[PDB]
């Protein structure tokens, strides 16, 4: 109700901020000029010296890079041949290994898979008989269980309806009057609430 | 009484559930025993035949595995010798390109650092001069900034006091009736909740 009075105080403080902003921006600009000019003299000296520092530094670096690269062509380059030759010999050594051991490993695999043909295959065949027996039990007990499920389902169904019938009646017989009473407690609440917050 | 009555219906449900649970456990276990019975009979195959066949199965694999290892041992020796002799030459060659080329690299590194030091000497010298120049500027300007900021803070405090005394007093005065009305609202709300919830 006193919003206008409260907003006035805020308008006053806002105006107070404006009272400060005036001289504040004035001195801020003066300070900015001081800083910019201060950094300006530093920048001129920095930039000027940079030309006399980066250039000789680049030259120094270029010389080092030249030596570095030269040394690389006198090391990495010739060593590339030494390493390549070593790699070639290594590859040759590997060839003389990947061939006998390669065929040997393949023969090992042959002996492995071949064994599996007389190991896994005949075993899965035996398992087929066992699976048939297991599945038979699953079908036998399962079929019986299906009847049990149906029986218990119908039994439980009778029990469920035996509860649903009276429960719903009782629930309705209780919810109806309770709802009416609830409406009363709601009406009194809503009416009073709207008056308190009016 | 709603909770008691509603619970009563649930209680009777538990009775019927338990009464049905009996036949359930009986039937389930009866069939489960048949499942296990099958597995018990199957055990004379699934676990018995597997332990019987595991003999030639493992004996075959173990036999071939022995050869597999013996072959690897028959190769490990000549291959290790090839690797040893090869590594000898490969590493020896690297040494011939590690000692002289290393000393050369170290020699070039001497100049690498020497040139850098020779360049860093005047650089660091002028860096200290740059720092002095910058520090002096930042000190002159800094002192001015501090004085100005101090004055700024002083003025800000004067206007801040407008928010600490007049504005705050105004706010307090405005909050007084606010608390007064809020008290009534809280009190009535407390009663409202008690009147309808109790
Ligand atoms: C153009 C405009 C003007 C100029 C502008 C640029 C100015 C630049 C001037 C200076 C910049 C310096 C920057 C670095 C400052 C800190 C240097 C430092 O304090 O270093 C300390 C280390 C300490 O070693 P320690 O024996 O105490 O520890 C031994 C530990 N334990 C037991 C393994 C082996 O000593 C070292 O780093 C040095 C020895 C190790 C060197 C490793 C390889 C470096 C690679 C190339 C050489 C680079 C030379 C330039 C500096 C490169 C830095 C990466
Ligand atoms: C003209 C100027 C030429 C400048 C040439 C500079 C290089 C010169 C060549 C060699 C000498 C300088 C080497 C400088 C770099 C290595 C510096 C170094 O001394 O490092 C040592 C650390 C040791 O660690 P630590 O765990 O043993 O001990 C600490 C951890 N603690 C606690 C658990 C033990 O590290 C190690 O020793 C492991 C090092 C593994 C190998 C690193 C090789 C780096 C070389 C090049 C990398 C370039 C990357 C470029 C990326 C951008 C591409 C565009
Ligand atoms: C001791 C206390 C223990 C706890 C007791 C808890 C008692 C709870 C009592 C009552 C249940 C209250 C919650 C009921 C929720 C709704 C149930 C229902 O009535 O939802 C029917 C719809 C029928 O389809 P509609 O297209 O008309 O969708 C209608 C929905 N609308 C809009 C979005 C398309 O359902 C659907 O829509 C989607 C599903 C359709 C049927 C899927 C059947 C799946 C097959 C087998 C699942 C068997 C689960 C058995 C769980 C145990 C049971 C004993
Ligand atoms: C409309 C129809 C909706 C569907 C209705 C379904 C009704 C049937 C299903 C569930 C009804 C459960 C009724 C439970 C009544 C109370 C039983 C009870 O005695 O409450 C208390 C007990 C003990 O206290 P506590 O253990 O809770 O805490 C102990 C805390 N401390 C250790 C401090 C000791 O609670 C216990 O005994 C823990 C009992 C846990 C029982 C879990 C369920 C078991 C049933 C089947 C499991 C799967 C079997 C088949 C698996 C096939 C695999 C292939
Ligand atoms: C649900 C979301 C996650 C699903 C994860 C699994 C996904 C894949 C499906 C099934 C895998 C289940 C893996 C876990 C199985 C249960 C493990 C377990 O921790 O169980 C514990 C219970 C309780 O005793 P405990 O050992 O914990 O505590 C006393 C002993 N202590 C000291 C050492 C603790 O064990 C018992 O209650 C008694 C157990 C008796 C077992 C007899 C087995 C006889 C052999 C064959 C029978 C027929 C099997 C047919 C195939 C069945 C496939 C499931
Ligand atoms: C119905 C007929 C069926 C017939 C079936 C036939 C095939 C059956 C299949 C397997 C049977 C295996 C039987 C093994 C019997 C020996 C077990 C054993 O004694 O073995 C001991 C070792 C070492 O034991 P130690 O060092 O303590 O003693 C060492 C003592 N000394 C030094 C003398 C070295 O241990 C081991 O062999 C354990 C090796 C396995 C370790 C698994 C660890 C898993 C851990 C976490 C689970 C991660 C799951 C990840 C899933 C996603 C993956 C991508
Ligand atoms: C308005 C903002 C600008 C003006 C700020 C003026 C006040 C500055 C100081 C504090 C500001 C207030 C908050 C606190 C700041 C940290 C103060 C401090 O006490 O920190 C100390 C640390 C550690 O000291 P310690 O362990 O070595 O010595 C310990 C004693 N004893 C050596 C015996 C080893 O200091 C260190 O860690 C060394 C590294 C410090 C951070 C360097 C990088 C800063 C990043 C940007 C600034 C760039 C400025 C460029 C020039 C602008 C000119 C206008
Ligand atoms: C922040 C800008 C304000 C601008 C207006 C005022 C300007 C005033 C004039 C100049 C500025 C001066 C700034 C000074 C900063 C000092 C920072 C600092 O180093 O302080 C350190 C103290 C440490 O602890 P201690 O000395 O108390 O105890 C110590 C107990 N022993 C010693 C055991 C160690 O801690 C403290 O000073 C606590 C400092 C708490 C500062 C709260 C500022 C709240 C301002 C606005 C709120 C909203 C911010 C986000 C706005 C987002 C907008 C988009
Ligand atoms: C971003 C980070 C990348 C990290 C990569 C790490 C692995 C690097 C692998 C090998 C080494 C580098 C091998 C680089 C080979 C480069 C070969 C090359 O032609 O690259 C062309 C690209 C071109 O980029 P652009 O985007 O500008 O143009 C693309 C073009 N329009 C198109 O897509 O058709 O530019 C580049 O790729 C960059 C070329 C830089 C050449 C430098 C040549 C330098 C010559 C000698 C060495 C001097 C060393 C000096 C320092 C010594 C130590 C101090
Ligand atoms: C009779 C009451 C008795 C006491 C009751 C006490 C309990 C009351 C509690 C609940 C009852 C009311 C329950 C109301 C449930 C409303 C549920 C609902 O509609 O959700 C959706 C609405 C949608 O609003 P809108 O469409 O404006 O905004 C949509 C939004 N932009 C978007 O698109 O995302 O979301 C919104 O409206 C939220 C923003 C609203 C902005 C306007 C908000 C306007 C708010 C007030 C209007 C001015 C009041 C001035 C003072 C009056 C008293 C002096
Ligand atoms: C549209 C504009 C509307 C403007 C409305 C303005 C209304 C103004 C109303 C009244 C004027 C202000 C009236 C202020 C009254 C309180 C003034 C005051 O500071 O009293 C001193 C106390 C001091 O607490 P201490 O914790 O230091 O005490 C000792 C401590 N308990 C111990 O035992 O160690 O601090 C306090 O009591 C208060 C909390 C201090 C910490 C706050 C810590 C910070 C907490 C909140 C502030 C930040 C909130 C950030 C929210 C971000 C949302 C995204």
């Amino acid at each position: 109700l006193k919003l206008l009075d409260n907003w006035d105080s805020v308008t006053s403080t806002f105006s107070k901020l404006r009272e400060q902003l005036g001289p504040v921006t004035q001195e801020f600009w003066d300070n900015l000029e001081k800083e910019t000019e201060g950094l300006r003299q530093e920048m001129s000296k920095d930039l000027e010296e940079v030309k006399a520092k980066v250039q000789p530094y680049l030259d120094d670096f270029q010389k080092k890079w030249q030596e570095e690269m030269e040394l690389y062509r006198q090391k990495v380059e010739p060593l590339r041949a030494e390493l390549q030759e070593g790699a070639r010999q290594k590859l040759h050594e590997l060839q003389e290994k990947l061939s006998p051991l390669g065929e040997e490993m393949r023969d090992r695999a042959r002996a492995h898979v071949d064994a599996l043909r007389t190991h896994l295959a005949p075993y899965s065949d035996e398992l087929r008989q066992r699976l048939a027996a297991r599945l038979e039990a699953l079908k036998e007990n399962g079929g019986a269980r299906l009847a049990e499920y149906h029986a218990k389902a119908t039994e439980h169904l009778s029990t469920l309806s035996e509860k649903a019938k009276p429960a719903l009646e009782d629930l309705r017989q209780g919810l109806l009057p309770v709802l009416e009473s609830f409406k009363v407690s709601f009406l009194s609440a809503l009416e009073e609430y709207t008056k308190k917050l009016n």
Side-chain angles (χ1 to χ4, degrees), chain A:
Chain A
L1 283 311
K2 286 79 65 183
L3 291 180
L4 296 177
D5 291 90
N6 178 263
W7 276 72
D8 177 71
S9 339
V10 189
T11 307
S12 310
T13 40
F14 277 158
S15 299
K16 278 296 166 201
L17 295 176
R18 301 166 183 166
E19 290 176 27
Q20 293 161 89
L21 284 178
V24 156
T25 48
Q26 289 165 30
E27 62 192 273
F28 188 48
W29 263 35
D30 209 282
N31 177 78
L32 286 173
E33 287 216 80
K34 288 196 196 72
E35 292 194 311
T36 48
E37 281 275 272
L39 288 161
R40 191 156 289 132
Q41 81 169 331
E42 301 181 308
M43 281 316 300
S44 28
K45 172 185 172 62
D46 204 292
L47 291 166
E48 278 299 271
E49 280 182 20
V50 148
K51 302 166 188 173
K53 281 170 183 297
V54 174
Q55 288 172 30
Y57 195 50
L58 278 175
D59 166 72
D60 179 274
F61 246 139
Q62 272 167 27
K63 281 159 177 163
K64 240 174 303 299
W65 289 335
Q66 274 287 32
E67 297 185 85
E68 199 75 31
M69 285 182 288
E70 271 257 300
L71 296 171
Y72 288 166
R73 298 187 186 103
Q74 285 136 24
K75 248 100 86 191
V76 182
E77 280 197 40
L79 270 169
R80 256 183 180 191
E82 259 103 75
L83 289 169
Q84 212 175 333
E85 213 67 282
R88 286 184 189 125
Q89 268 297 90
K90 180 178 168 182
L91 288 176
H92 179 231
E93 289 176 285
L94 292 176
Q95 288 182 332
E96 301 233 83
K97 291 162 183 56
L98 293 175
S99 310
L101 292 173
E103 280 292 286
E104 183 187 270
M105 184 265 290
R106 276 183 183 143
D107 207 78
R108 291 175 189 229
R110 285 168 166 175
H112 272 261
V113 182
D114 192 51
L116 300 176
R117 294 167 183 141
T118 334
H119 283 194
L120 290 179
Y123 195 55
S124 32
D125 203 41
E126 261 128 30
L127 286 169
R128 282 165 181 138
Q129 306 169 148
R130 303 180 198 163
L131 291 178
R134 212 168 306 171
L135 280 172
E136 201 151 86
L138 302 179
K139 286 182 294 184
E140 197 69 285
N141 306 333
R145 278 189 180 111
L146 293 179
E148 291 155 32
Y149 266 98
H150 276 222
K152 267 95 265 266
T154 32
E155 288 190 278
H156 205 192
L157 179 69
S158 311
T159 320
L160 292 176
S161 36
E162 175 206 273
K163 217 109 300 95
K165 284 190 181 191
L168 290 192
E169 294 300 329
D170 268 82
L171 283 178
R172 283 182 181 142
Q173 288 180 332
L175 289 171
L176 283 186
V178 92
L179 279 176
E180 300 316 283
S181 306
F182 279 161
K183 291 164 181 173
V184 181
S185 45
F186 276 133
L187 284 174
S188 43
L190 296 172
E191 205 191 287
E192 296 212 80
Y193 281 144
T194 317
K195 290 172 182 178
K196 261 83 184 187
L197 298 145
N198 207 271

